[PDB]
Amino acid sequence: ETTDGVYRVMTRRLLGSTQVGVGVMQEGVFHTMWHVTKGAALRSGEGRLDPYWGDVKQDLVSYCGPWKLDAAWDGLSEVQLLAVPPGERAKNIQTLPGIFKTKDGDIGAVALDYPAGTSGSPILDKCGRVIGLYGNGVVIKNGSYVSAITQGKR
Amino acid sequence: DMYIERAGDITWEKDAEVTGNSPRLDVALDESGDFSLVE
Numbered sequence: 001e002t003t004d005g006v007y008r009v010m011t012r013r014l015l016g017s018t019q020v021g022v023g024v025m026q027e028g029v030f031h032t033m034w035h036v037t038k039g040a041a042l043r044s045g046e047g048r049l050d051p052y053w054g055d056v057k058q059d060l061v062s063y064c065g066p067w068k069l070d071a072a073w074d075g076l077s078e079v080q081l082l083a084v085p086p087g088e089r090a091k092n093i094q095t096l097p098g099i100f101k102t103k104d105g106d107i108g109a110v111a112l113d114y115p116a117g118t119s120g121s122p123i124l125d126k127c128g129r130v131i132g133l134y135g136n137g138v139v140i141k142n143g144s145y146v147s148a149i150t151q152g153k154r
Numbered sequence: 155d156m157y158i159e160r161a162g163d164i165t166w167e168k169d170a171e172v173t174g175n176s177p178r179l180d181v182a183l184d185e186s187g188d189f190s191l192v193e
């Protein structure tokens with residue numbers, strides 16, 4: 001299957017079937033975070049998806065083609081995490097991003113806490129465009145989790 | 155060996171639950187792709 005949409009990334013190497021992450025199929029390319037697959041090939045039914053581009057520092061990887069997602073947070077509006085937790089139905093969570101301030105610029109960040117296997121879930125703007133992927137972040141003084149809105153370059 | 159399974163369309167949900175705050179955080183990104191808090 002190559003239909004656009006959000007997909008679970010599963011493995012049967014561990015006990016039972018384990019969800020290690022999530023990703024986005026768009027324009028024939030599968031997008032997820034590097035730490036989910038570590039750059040390894042993927043199976044899609046009887047087909048094979050080979051890695052095409054990846055970068056550990058960005059924590060991103062694309063399959064079958066170059067990175068296609070290029071929408072960006074507008075810095076003002078609420079967004080929605082389309083969270084796909086392990087063993088649970090996809091659900092939209094609306095939030096106003098905060099900001100990661102870095103020496104190389106600012107990026108949006110979402111203060112939402114989900115299981116590790118939710119890594120790669122897409123964050124969307126009000127037009128439904130994917131502005132980044134969830135799952136690379138920091139733990140705050142409160143112990144809470146905050147994920148960068150991680151977007152590639154098209 | 156990993157495989158993918160479709161989980162839905164990518165669409166905005168009109169009546170989604172709304173939660174989460176909006177912290178402004180000084181962070182650093184290292185060569186391994188890990189973010190750290192700068193304090």
Ligand SMILES: CCC(=O)N[C@@H](CCCCN)C(=O)N[C@@H](CCCCN)C(=O)NCCCCCNC(=N)N
Nearest residue numbers: 035059116119135136137138144145187188189190
């Ligand atoms: C589970 C511990 C944790 O939050 N790790 C952080 C990284 C902190 C780095 C500090 N220098 C993280 O972002 N992990 C990534 C994997 C490493 C990505 C590496 N590029 C992860 O499993 N994300 C999915 C959501 C996990 C939510 C955890 N929630 C709490 N810790 N309360």
